[PDB]
């Protein structure tokens, strides 16, 4: 609970904190990544890699 003072005020243009998003669906709060669009191929590739390792 204890405060530490250090109050600071910045105009909105020169604020030092910058949140960013890659893809933002309207209505939500957090964005989405590029990898999410191609999950099926990676999932289908991992199992084949496992089978190849078993044969090796």
């Amino acid at each position: 609970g204890l405060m530490l003072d250090n109050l600071e005020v910045y105009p909105e243009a020169i604020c030092p904190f910058i949140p960013a998003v890659w893809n933002l669906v309207t209505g939500e709060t957090y964005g989405r990544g590029l990898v999410e669009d191609y999950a099926g191929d990676l999932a289908k590739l991992s199992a084949l890699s496992e089978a190849l390792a078993l044969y090796e």
Binding site: R32, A39, G40, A43, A47
Partner: protein
Amino acid sequence: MELLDAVNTCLTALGEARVTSTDTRHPSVALILQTLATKQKLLLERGWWFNTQDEEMFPDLLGRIPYPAASISVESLDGYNIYSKRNNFLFNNTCNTMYFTGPVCIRVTYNLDFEDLPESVATVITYRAARAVYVGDLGNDASVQDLVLNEQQAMLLVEEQHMRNKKHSTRRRRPWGKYQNALSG
């Protein structure tokens, strides 16, 4: 399929006259019944879609786990452990001991009444018993080639029915589930 029908079929195949009750004191009826029972017990040993279930057993005060009376075979399901039947009790083959510490999981194959068996299984059993009796009582004549053929035709239907009931599929493997989970977001 009543036992009387199978007995009459065997008698007709053997050439003797038909009967009316399975309790008749004819001496061939006892041999027919014993052969039918033995063949039925042997056939169902492997396990099919109607006589296989999973069950859990608990130890006694001393630590001995008995097994069901109607079972024909036992198998383990705990890792790579091995179990077997000995002295009317389960034996721990992996540790060479008879006393257990807790419950276990095992596969069991049960023996059922002749009436409850499907028609296809009953035909196979009847035609196996008929040949087993005819060959041992009258020699290997040229008429056994029909009994063997009937047995093979019945076995084909039995296998087809078992394959149909089990409903095996490639969608039940876990990689498909993982793929479907991935295809969601």
